[PDB]
Design a protein around this ligand. Structure first.
Ligand code: DAR
Length: 340
């Protein structure tokens, strides 16, 4: 690798480690914000569009219910998410602006990206052309090069987690499964269609799972559906571990070749996990037209710009029941979340 890349990544790691070792805490409070709209909801939390009452800036506020986090066994994961997000800095990662907790909830206040999820755009249009898929894939390749160099594994790549910004570039959101790992890790987590075989088979796994997931993502972007699909998870897992994948005839030969090397069941033979690391991907013929520096610098004109009216427009997000943000009179789960 060129010394310029080595020095970039060394500085990136220095800056990450300083924040990793001394995390920010308690940098706003709930009554600094007005609530606008629920943007998404899950088993233990929600994401809400909020507006800061003094600056007028809009943010996406992820709210996690402490009692549900404990019950759903996500304590370490929620601490990972916040500690990682407050320490990273890369063009294609959403910025954490504030964090805090109260008696009931944990809060992560991130930049609001009004263009919505890639998943919505993909499902609207059907499939992305190879140039369009490649533009997005290049951003993920660079983002994983950054994260992996910091000893971070992402573990939840999928179009739902890739927001499209005002310039048409990606912002990765949702660090709920991200973790700093030297060596191997063991937790069963992810999304069924995107799980690598070694996760399914309960092995000690490494950053190779992210490169597998990139193969799934590229396939899904270019086909419009994922490579391993079935009605129930166990049927999906059987397909994943089988070593078989079928490609649409419209895929280029170069795309198929790259995908066979990312969707390689044997992790010791998978692109991104060989001696040349990320460079086996960056140098693959499917990426021959990619100017990696221009992508990093956001100098490539994007395939499309989402339609939205301004920084508070919610049109690219869907509608959910609006529920209270209740804060108990009594502190819950204080010990578990001391470091947050
Ligand atoms: N494939 C993908 N990006 N995410 C999983 C989607 C599962 C289900 N909503 C569906 O098939 O619509």
């Amino acid at each position: 690798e060129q010394e310029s890349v080595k020095e970039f990544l060394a500085k990136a790691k220095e800056e990450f480690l300083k924040k990793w070792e001394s995390p920010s805490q308690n940098t706003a409070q709930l009554d600094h914000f007005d609530r606008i709209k629920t943007l998404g909801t899950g088993s233990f939390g929600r994401v809400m569009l909020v507006k800061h009452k003094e600056t007028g800036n809009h943010y996406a506020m992820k709210i996690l219910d402490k009692q549900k986090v404990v019950k759903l066994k996500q304590i370490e994961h929620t601490l990972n998410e916040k500690r990682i997000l407050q320490a990273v800095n890369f063009p294609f990662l959403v910025k954490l602006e504030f964090s805090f907790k109260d008696n009931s909830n944990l809060y992560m206040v991130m930049e609001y990206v009004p263009g919505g999820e890639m998943f919505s755009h993909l499902r609207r249009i059907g499939r992305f052309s190879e140039p369009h898929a490649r533009f997005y894939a290049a951003q993920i390749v660079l983002t994983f090069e950054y994260l992996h160099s910091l000893d971070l594994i992402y573990r939840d790549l999928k179009p739902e987690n890739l927001l499209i910004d005002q310039q048409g570039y990606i912002q990765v959101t949702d660090f709920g499964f991200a973790k700093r790992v030297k060596g191997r890790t063991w937790t069963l987590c992810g999304t069924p269609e995107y799980l690598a075989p070694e996760i399914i088979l309960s092995k000690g796994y490494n950053k190779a799972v992210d490169w597998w997931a990139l193969g799934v993502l590229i396939y899904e972007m270019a086909a419009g559906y994922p490579p391993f699909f079935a009605d129930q998870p166990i049927q999906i897992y059987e397909k994943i571990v089988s070593g078989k994948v079928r490609f649409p005839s419209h895929f280029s030969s170069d795309l198929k070749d790259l995908l066979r090397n990312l969707l390689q069941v044997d992790l010791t033979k998978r692109f991104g996990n060989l001696k040349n690391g990320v460079n086996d991907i960056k140098n693959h013929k499917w990426f021959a037209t990619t100017d990696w520096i221009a992508i990093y610098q956001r100098k490539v004109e994007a395939p499309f710009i989402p339609k939205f009216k301004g920084p508070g427009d919610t049109s690219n997000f869907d509608d959910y029941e609006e529920e209270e943000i209740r804060v108990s009179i009594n502190e819950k789960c204080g010990k578990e979340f001391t470091e947050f």
